[PDB]
């Protein structure tokens, strides 16, 4: 939080100490008494601004939407267990057939993470970077851009997947219709999880609810630039009986009320190590359909037999 | 929120400054002292109205019902992956057969969004506008209005869908019974999601719970038209030691307590870009069952082979 | 809320103005000073009763159980899509066979709504009213009451349903075993939703948690019959510096703290237009298995073909 | 709550009135002034103990775990609809075969409710009481106790169930493999619901979180034995201007803060009428597989035919 | 909580009594008056630190993530019911075949619990301890470490499982394709539950949200080392009218605000008796596929027959 509060905090340190130096050195004595009345006014009536109430529900919606995206991580490990076993063949066709199926299922999640996450988007700026990272063969790029559509194209590989499995069934690679439908029902589970992330980016927390909660924090501490001044102890106002030149508890109070504001900036749109997550789901999925197709260990007895 | 608070806010600015001009220019000195006693009374006892408690749970129910409708967006991308692959045929019959199936599944969500959303309803005022936008052929409109029913008719295409797939199976287009049941089980998932939006419009947040929370905000600031007046500083009441002619912190306090009231007016009934969402789900679904039926890219090797 | 607060509110108006007339006209001057000490005592120490804390969680459980019953509305539209297509036959047997299946599935929800809802129970007082409304033939009523069971009998039609579909399969009306199991798996989804409403009536919010929250509201305002009196302004107590003869902010405070109590009486047991919901689910379900069995519109081309 | 607060409440009535009689009759006048200083100290500084904050989240976890167990009630009505229809046979074997299947599915929930509920455990103290109540034949008791296992044995009938259905399939009682798998997939739903109750008893709310919230209530009112004393009105302390000999609002404040503590004792471990629930699920399940196997009513026409 | 608060509590007892002894014995009388002004300053302005607000939501996220992991306990009892019945064979091959399937399904949860739980990790430090506990034969360890992968390897047995069942089907041990797919669909449910625990360890509660809530507790009671001092009663400050040498209510206030901090340290990463849970899921799963394959009790009549 110290990195996120290097900008807004030191402005508030600067905006306080400016006004503190102006009051102590620049104002005439007749004009200081004008400042003392506004300082007593803004100290008692800045509690009318519901800072703990407005900011309290905005964290209850940034985070309750933040947690709903980590049940939305598309793991290919459910399709991987069924492509590895059912799509038969050890020759260079069926070995190529299984690697293509688990490459489309990962491409159906890279094309959505490069529109919701800046970390993936700086790894894959254009579509040419997807080809050079092995997620798309050059012959698939020509078919990807003859399909003229002004919308997002993350649904392209999840239709190529389901058309390849049926083509795989009609050549005898998948045995029955039930084993074919078992793959397609696990495609549409990963299509739902990828379909959530597209739905969460397109449906943000509304602008009407963000512009409210950023005034309630800033207009509070705008009044605290005046209402938290150390007044003159010679006038002996009730409450300001001591001069200390640094408001310790005001700067702590700005640290937390603006702290949740900078936290909720972060958690409204996460994924700002998906560079690691994509490198896992590609390296595992191609591993478990090529090296582990029928390579099983040897069946032997356990330590509990008779 | 500034657009939503152009009406209620400037009335409250007008209702304050009217009474402020009446007290400062119209009341006699004997009658001003009558006003000063009511101003001190309504300042101390307007805190008895639980504004932060009544409004606190109404936002907890407008929004917790608002978020439950965005898991209810009917996406056709689960039926689209199975109509594209299983319903065989490249001739002009099966090409027409697949386009009809994905047109009924989109029509089973336009007919529910034109009764829950004013944006869709101004795009489709009558049923004639649905025909001219290609969602319904003219021969389907005659069958749509011989079915005499006083209720909503959004369930009509989702029965025409399931009767067409079985007619498609009996002509040999779908291979097995499992692949037929795989389509119908994914119909009834989109029928459940469309069934939620019909259930959410018919079950609103009750009138007994809205009429409570709109008195608690308005009757508070009705007392704040009197209890927040800048009194005469010559009388030297405790608290009103300064005249400033504009209550800054009261107008901020009205900005947030009526702010959540106008936000909860918006989020109790959302969809007031479904004009874009309908144009996506029609343009994608007809694309992936006509241009992408067996048009697959050429299988080649990846960048990780040996 | 005005209809629900016609009884408890006017008692509280009467109980206040009685004591206000007794203090102003009946008590002797020596006995008025005894009343002034109890009024100051009950004004400062009635804040010890946690009204906003006890009532705050009871609304958090009435409503969080209220919202869980509207995902429990049994819609027959999932069984209707599969009875309409799979149960073949156009003769007067299979036409009678499909209407019987969708009549048992609606009877398996009327028999549970006539034990959880007073609105349905006044429409169907006895079992004879169910026969005259067409939900049960007279020959089914004799079989319904030879089954001797002291418990609820809402599970009777959902077993008659699953025994009729298997009898329908053995006569050749349903084609395969998968299409039979597709109907029975959608029966057991509607059996779960009807099974929730039976579980919610049998498991109420406990008596130990309702008797707490109805003392905390009533014993608060029992003290507010004394602690909110307008005292004599001649004695000049701190706080009671003005006589106004009507406590406006106390009557508003009773309007909301007893307001949530009457709201939570309503939402602990909803359905007190299920007379419309039953008339929809019967009129739609019999419509879509008799008039819409194989009556499909004519396949023609859309407005986007070449 | 009056039954649950007969023990802790009257101790607090006794502990108050003891100290009240000691202060008024036993202490010397010099020693009373020592007591008056501690009474003023414990009145102002007992508000530092966060009673409304510590107890506020413990109710938010007792009840949020309490409500998650009533979606965990194992209803046999999903298996009952499939055993009644698919397991064929009207002779004394298949009649015995269906009754055994629905008896194992109820025994797979009695053996878990006799370890989580004291009400079931006093009905079934040992395993011999299960035999005499008809839930287990004497020949099944010998096989139940040759299976040597130090853990809980509630999973024993749910494996005997799935081994009997496959034995039923190999004798021709169940027709296809899909109808066999339809029973086993509905077994594993009731195995999950019974698996929740075993998981909820084994994972309690931790001891580190219960010992916190029982100090915060008791150490508060331990200070309220001193801080709520009616002091001497002759000394004229601020606040204690009246002697009344019974603290009405303190005893109400103890009624609710200890009220939620006794409520959360009840709802952390419910089921302390499962004697009725077990008698329902046995009497219904054996009824709907013996009297209602193919006993259907006669098909006749409804009141809406032509 | 007493064990968890042996470290931080006695430091706070020591840090208080140090400053209390310094003020009472070391400071000069002119320097004591400097301390009295800071004690009055830190007593009134330490309430500006939102301790009950910052810590209130951190418990709402530690625990709401804590409860979501106990629906994530991988129970093998759903696969166990289907391996026991469908994988046929009583000879020493099929007896070895069923024990291997339920050993891979337990190994697919030990390899994830030895990276998320320190209790399992001290039981299984290296992979050699897994072999000596019977969870992995020595021939499986060579195949486990030829699969070169820098990521976690918990997905290895859940692919060996699905490759063994298909190898079991092609030798005639499993009858149909539906019974094969019934096992694989229950594998991918246990793969999802094991997939949650890997997702919960990799996605912790962020460092930006923990470093906030540990300053708000500690910087509060850092000021309470000064603001809670018993001042000199001879100076007669308002509030400090009594010397007692031990702040009872401050030490209680530190007991709960730091109490939730130490509780949330525990519940952010639970499983710190999984040594019992692993010993159950191995001893039960191998028991119900070897001793209970077709060993059923003898079918006899119940106590309710005619």
Author numbering:
A (entry chain C), B (entry chain B), C (entry chain A), D (entry chain E), E (entry chain D): 28 to 299, 306 to 339
Reported in the publication:
BEST1-4 proteins are expressed in the plasma membrane and form Ca2+-activated Cl- channels by assembling as pentamers. The channel comprises five BEST1 subunits arranged symmetrically around a central ion pore that is ~95 Å long. The diameter of the pore varies along its length and contains two constrictions, the ‘neck’ and the ‘aperture’, both of which are lined by hydrophobic amino acids. To address these questions we determined a series of cryo-electron microscopy (cryo-EM) structures of chicken BEST1 with and without Ca2+ in activated, deactivated, and inactivated states that represent the major gating transitions of the channel.
We find that the W287F mutation (BEST1345 W287F) produces channels with dramatically altered gating. Whilst BEST1345 W287F retained normal Cl- versus K+ selectivity, the W287F mutation constitutively activates the channel, making it nearly insensitive to the presence or absence of Ca2+. To understand the molecular basis of this behavior, we determined cryo-EM structures of BEST1345 W287F in the presence and absence of Ca2+ at 2.7 Å and 3.0 Å resolutions, respectively. Thus, in accord with the electrophysiological recordings, the W287F mutation decouples Ca2+ binding from the conformational changes in the neck that are observed for the wild type channel.
